[PDB]
Amino acid sequence: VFGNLHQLGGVPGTYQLVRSFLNIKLPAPLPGLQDGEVEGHPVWALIYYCMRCGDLLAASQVVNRAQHQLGEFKTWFQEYMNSKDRRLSPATENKLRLHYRRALRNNTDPYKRAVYCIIGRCDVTDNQSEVADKT
Amino acid sequence: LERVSLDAVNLALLMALLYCFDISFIEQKQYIATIHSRLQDSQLWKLPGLQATVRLAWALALRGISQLPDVTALAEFTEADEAMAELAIADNVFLFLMESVVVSQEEFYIRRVHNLITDFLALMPMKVKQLRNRADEDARMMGNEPPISLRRDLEHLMLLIGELYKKNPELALEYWCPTVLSKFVRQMGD
Known part of the structure; x- marks a missing residue:
């Protein structure tokens, strides 16, 4: 971000910096493919990267x-965040897991899967298909 | 009867079994207690659906029997009844009722069954609500017919009514005549 552009149009907030990474950096050669996008922004990718940033x-x-x-x-997501980040409810975690297996696991947008898997610790057999790009 | 699933012949025995459970008081209740225990154990059998029904039916009756508190105090409801009944529902106890009802000694059968059907309303309402609430939450906003039907236990019950009552007005009147069924209808309307 700290190098030309726009200079990003908006304020230097962390969110925007990541939007820039996702938009300007290599998610698009000249934009496109299989993300869920609203108003020009891959939301799931954003959540994933923001998460990546910490x-x-x-x-x-x-x-x-x-x-x-x-x-x-x-x-x-919110209680995972609230706690020490080992979001352990004696309650639902089980429910989230079932949904992942049935609905999410066989399908979806790579980033969405990443967020579910990572936050949830959903499927211990480990690896994220499309978006593991670095060691 | 187990050593029959499809065999229509099963219907012939339903009068005896429905009425038998209806008159549980006759048994002792050392015996009734023993049956109850054996049945909970018997949850092993999914393949026999009709075992599952009859047992579920017994439970619907048993709850009423426990009214003389010597029995009821002894038992814990969650363990003693709800857990088992719930298991039976999961094991398609409603589905087979629907089948019995849909695929309709007529007097004995109609009378005994309508007693069965009604017992379920009055004694069972906790189960109805449990299921209804369960169903509302379960589906999420590509559903296949099989997925739609899986949880459909409550609707199945409604159909049970529809098939059993159909024609038969006699029976049907019971719903309307006094303002628990009438409660049932109001409830279902909700």
Whole structure:
């Protein structure tokens, strides 16, 4: 971000810096393919990267604003965040896991899968298909 | 009867079994207690659906029997009844009722069954609510017919009514005549 552009149009907030990474950096040669995008922005990729950065809170906020419909997950994100990040509810974690296996596991947008898998610790057999790009 | 699933012949025995459970008081209740225990154990059998029904039916009755508190105090409801009944529902106890009802000694059968059907309303309402709430939450906003039907236990019950009652007005009147069924209808309307 700290190098030309726009200089990004908006304020230097962390969120925008990541939007820049996702948009300017190599998610697009000349933009496209299989993300879920609203208003020109891959939300799931954003949450994933923000999470990658360590900005969990911001990632949570993005989800809140998201316009999505897996919303139960939204709940499970927030408490994961609230606690020590080992979100352990004696309650639902089990429920989240079932949904992952049935709905999410066989399908979806790579980043969405990443967020579910990583936050949830959903499927211990380990690896994320499309978006592991670095060692 | 187990050593029959499809065999229609099963219907012939339903009068005896329905009425038998209806008159559980006659048994002792050392015996009734023993049956109850054996049945909970018997949850092993999914393949026999009709075992599952009859047992579930017994439970619907047993709850009423426990009214003389000597029995009821002894038992814990969650362990003693709800857990088992719930298991039976999961094991398609409603589905087979629906089948019995849909695929309709007529007097004995109609009378005994309608007693069965009604017992379920009055004694069972906790189960109905449990299932209804379960169903509302379960599906999420590509559902296949099989997925739609899986959880459908409550609707199946409604159909049970529809098949059993159909024609038969006699029976049907019971719903309307006094303002628990009438409660049932109000409930279902919700």
